[PDB]
Amino acid sequence: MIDDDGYRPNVGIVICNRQGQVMWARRFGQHSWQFPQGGINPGESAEQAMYRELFEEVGLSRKDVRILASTRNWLRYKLPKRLVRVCIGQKQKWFLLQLVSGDAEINMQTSSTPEFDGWRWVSYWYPVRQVVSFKRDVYRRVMKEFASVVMSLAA
Numbered sequence: 001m002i003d004d005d006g007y008r009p010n011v012g013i014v015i016c017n018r019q020g021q022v023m024w025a026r027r028f029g030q031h032s033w034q035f036p037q038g039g040i041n042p043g044e045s046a047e048q049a050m051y052r053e054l055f056e057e058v059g060l061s062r063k064d065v066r067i068l069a070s071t072r073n074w075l076r077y078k079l080p081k082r083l084v085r086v087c088i089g090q091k092q093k094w095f096l097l098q099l100v101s102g103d104a105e106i107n108m109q110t111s112s113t114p115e116f117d118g119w120r121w122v123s124y125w126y127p128v129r130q131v132v133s134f135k136r137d138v139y140r141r142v143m144k145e146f147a148s149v150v151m152s153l154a155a
């Protein structure tokens with residue numbers, strides 16, 4: 001499950017529309033919001049894990065989205081020492097998806113273990129200043145990499 005360095009291989013998902021917005025989801029039973037992210041299971045490609053977690057967490061099919069971009073290397077963050085439960089952080093590949101189906105297709109309850117209560121569209125800049133602190137450096141990098149593509153859709 002975990003590599004030699006203590007990092008869990010993980011995929012993260014930025015879903016956008018053609019209005020310069022991204023999909024912002026509220027953590028189940030909490031007050032904090034984030035992008036979907038999920039662990040890569042043994043034997044999966046990153047893209048496979050992404051589509052699995054896409055449905056598990058957001059209820060979307062491959063058929064509902066198109067992949068616009070992905071990050072070319074692993075982005076890493078470490079967990080706060082207090083939050084460590086061995087896994088000391090995640091190494092993430094991030095995907096940029098455009099939602100092409102209707103907003104109504106997003107469903108947080110297709111799986112037996114929902115991770116989000118629900119969602120809303122937010123302005124492109126919003127996530128970097130709103131995500132939990134220990135993910136902010138990764139988020140800054142991700143949004144910088146995806147920025148030109150999302151803006152192109154909104155032009």
Ligand SMILES: [Cl-]
Binds near residue numbers: 018
């Ligand atoms: Cl549209």
Ligand SMILES: [Mg+2]
Binds near residue numbers: 036037039057115
């Ligand atoms: Mg998750």
Ligand SMILES: [Mg+2]
Binds near residue numbers: 038039053056057115
């Ligand atoms: Mg998940």
Ligand SMILES: [Mg+2]
Binds near residue numbers: 038039053
């Ligand atoms: Mg998972």
